From a paper:
Membrane fusion is a critical step in entry for any enveloped virus, and in hantaviruses it is mediated by the highly conserved [name]. In particular, hantavirus Gc inserts residues from three different loops into the target membrane to drive fusion, as confirmed functionally by structure-guided mutagenesis on the HPS-inducing Andes virus, instead of having a single “fusion loop”.
Despite multiple trials, rGc failed to crystallize on its own, and we therefore screened a human single-chain variable domain (scFv) antibody fragment library, which in principle was hantavirus-naïve, to identify potential binders that could act as crystallization chaperones. Further analysis by size-exclusion chromatography (SEC) together with multi-angle light scattering (MALS), showed that scFv A5 forms a 1:1 complex with rGc. We obtained crystals diffracting to 3Å resolution of the A5/rGc complex at pH 7.5, after limited proteolysis of the complex with trypsin. The final electron density map was clear for amino acids (aa) 16–414 of rGc (out of residues 1–457 in the intact Gc ectodomain), with internal breaks at loops 84–91 and 108–132. These disordered segments map to the tip of domain II, at the membrane interacting region. The surface area buried at the interface between domains I and III is very small, and is stabilized in the crystals by a cobalt-hexamine ion, which was identified in crystal optimization screens to improve the diffraction of the crystals. Addition of the scFv A5 interfered with lipid binding, in line with its epitope lying close to the membrane interacting region of Gc. Because the A5 epitope overlaps with that of the neutralizing Mab 3G1, our data suggest that the neutralization mechanism of antibodies targeting this region involves blocking membrane insertion of Gc.
Numbering used by the authors:
A (entry chain A): 15 to 86, 90 to 107, 129 to 204, 207 to 414
B (entry chain L): 2 to 9, 11 to 95, 95A, 95B, 96 to 106, 106A
C (entry chain H): 1 to 35, 35A, 36 to 82, 82A, 82B, 82C, 83 to 96, 101 to 113
The structure:
Amino acid sequence: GVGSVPMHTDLELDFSLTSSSKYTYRRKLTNPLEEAQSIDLHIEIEEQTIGVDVHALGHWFDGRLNLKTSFHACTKYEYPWHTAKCHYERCTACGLYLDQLKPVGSAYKIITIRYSRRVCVQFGEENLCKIIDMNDCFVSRHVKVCIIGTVSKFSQGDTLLFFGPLGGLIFKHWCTSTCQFGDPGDIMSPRDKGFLCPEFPGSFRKKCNFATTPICEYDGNMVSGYKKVMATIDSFQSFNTSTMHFTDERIEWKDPDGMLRDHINILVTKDIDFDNLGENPCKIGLQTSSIEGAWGSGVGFTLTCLVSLTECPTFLTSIKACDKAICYGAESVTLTRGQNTVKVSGKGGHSGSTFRCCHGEDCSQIGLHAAAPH
Amino acid sequence: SELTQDPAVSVALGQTVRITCQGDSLRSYYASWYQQKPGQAPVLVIYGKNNRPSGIPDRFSGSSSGNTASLTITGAQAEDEADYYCNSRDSSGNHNVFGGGTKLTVL
Amino acid sequence: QVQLQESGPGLVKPSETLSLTCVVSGGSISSSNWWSWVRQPPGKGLEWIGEIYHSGSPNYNPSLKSRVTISVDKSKNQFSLKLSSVTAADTAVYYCARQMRQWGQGTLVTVSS
Ligand SMILES: *[C@@H]1O[C@H](CO)[C@@H](O)[C@H](O)[C@H]1NC(C)=O
């Protein structure tokens, strides 16, 4: 079933929830003080949504670095690879050029991140839902729901890579202005407008002599950035994606497998009116019997009420003297099963007042006029 | 093949022409464009990224995106009625391959 | 400035070995780095045969390799081409080009019998 919680103090829940998990909390909040009347609390927390503001960096490429050596007043010699989009050239000559260029993904620089969760709270007959974030607690009269923060493999300034079809890697270090071959992000096509070539910081070691024929020997890095990443893939954090929403300069999705957790704090105020707002399986009938005293300022009046309790042996509550949804007095009483006589002292009202015996929002059908104070 | 063109393209005088060439090596290499008139040797028009030889009009332009490369002729004139061949390096990096050619008729 | 002119035998019988000659005039053949052969059959498109950018070794088209031999000599100062065991599909106009910028006017070769 569902457990009960005597609200002797504020209830507080503090816990960590998996981003791809929902959470349900249900409890009967029973009256502190020696009464077992109770208000239902029902909380539903939905899966985490991830929203990121980004700058699109264009496509990352794989490729193969090739080195060709040529010997024959070098100037002007055109070589058949001068039509290569990325080539570097330094009697003999040496030529690096990039071949087998293939796109492997679209990359995006994170500007700002925001984790949301939808939260629904029912407290008694009140039900309210809100999408919350760390900068916006769920607030109601009796219940607060806060996200303290999230443990995340994503960060600001990080770069996200999407494999085709949109796989995914997190990079904490992405080349921006100067890219050397072998770096993450080394070969880029931003905007698709042009081709951004990497640099080759290595040196050419010209081996020169007779008969053996010369060889150009480049001593820099020969392995592309993409290959280096795949070769040490465990150094990088992968992610999977579901329920995507690619709005060009914003990406919102739900993480489908573990990965992130957040901290949830739930606080439920002790200050609760268990009358009016709460329930009791006890059924109470009220009727006015008689009245004495005066309306308005002075001695005041006393209303006698007949009060019936069923479905329990005793019930501690308050019986009130009210008129037209204004109350003028109340008496606390422990009722016994069957009929009870309760005298309630009150003050106030006017000549047109009909004072009824009342409990919560329920009042008897009969009410009485008190006498004039003159 | 591995360097395909459209066989024939027809243009009315004054309009703008776009001759496209598509191949796997075209995203590793800039295409070369050659113009051939009947009974004459081929003539280079475009190489690299929009670089072009002297004696060649301003209306010839170079274009690349993905695995395609395009030769654009803005404000076409009658003398442009010729063959157009797309030329690039092979993916192996050892061969030089031509396209199927494109017969441009000016009206 | 130089002007290229390629010459051949015109008409040859099948299986007979073909031999082209591209003469460089107005300058040296070593003035330009890289020389290329390319042929086109009548009514058809261009086909790259081979090129010599390198004093070390030439590039050849896979389909035409072995059958075709290309050379550069400085004594006679001319660009050389030799096709072995010629069929009725080798009949084409053979072009000589340096840096693929400057072209000779070509020479027709027909293979019939
Ligand atoms: C999604 O990615 C995770 C690692 O991030 C991997 O363990 C999981 O197998 C992937 N999903 C499927 C269906 O393969």
